[PDB]
């Protein structure tokens with residue numbers, strides 16, 4: 001147990017709409033976690049948008065997954081005590097050339 | 100002041116190498132922050148890699164910036180007390196068609 005005190009008081013999305021692998025944001029809620037709200041990226045298409053503005057299945061949109069840390073209420077339902085925990089989240093999409 | 104207790108004991112770019120907007124990782128260190136080490140994505144090219152494996156400058160690789168939370172030592176140098184803080188980090192790269 002390495003217990004520390006944390007003060008939770010903290011003191012373009014239209015540019016990425018031009019991506020060849022565009023994505024939408026999905027709101028992910030968990031009342032036993034801090035942050036309770038996490039916005040997850042979901043690729044709009046299986047393929048990538050080509051030079052003509054059409055979805056081209058010769059390339060694939062893939063989510064960029066990142067490991068992040070979240071606070072898990074410990075004991076469960078605790079409003080003021082937590083344990084650090086690792087989860088995988090989608091932070092955007094990229095276009096890849098298949099194998 | 101919204102002070103909570105946190106147990107820091109966790110219970111426990113090469114993947115996307117085929118991207119048309121590939122990136123490398125850059126190590127960012129700050130001893131006054133938790134995590135002290137943060138890996139930032141840097142786009143390998145200004146343009147995007149086409150089907151032939153050549154860089155095409157009619158499209159741009161752009162870093163995807165996201166707001167993440169970090170712990171800032173408060174008071175400075177404190178080993179056991181922090182304040183939650185927002186920072187902007189580059190999490191990967193995407194290929195965009197420029198504003199024409």
Ligand SMILES: O=C(N[C@H](C(=O)Nc1ncc(Cn2c(=O)[nH]c3ccccc32)s1)C1CCC(F)(F)CC1)/C(F)=C\C1CC1
Pocket residue numbers: 034035038039066067068069070071084089091105133134136137138139166167168169170183188189190
């Ligand atoms: O920020 C969120 N969580 C914070 C966090 O994980 N910070 C991180 N910094 C660096 C991290 C590792 N890493 C890199 O090196 N490059 C990254 C690029 C993208 C993502 C992670 C990256 S992970 C926690 C919040 C609780 C805390 F304050 F106790 C400890 C920090 C969070 F939960 C959600 C945000 C996606 C909305």
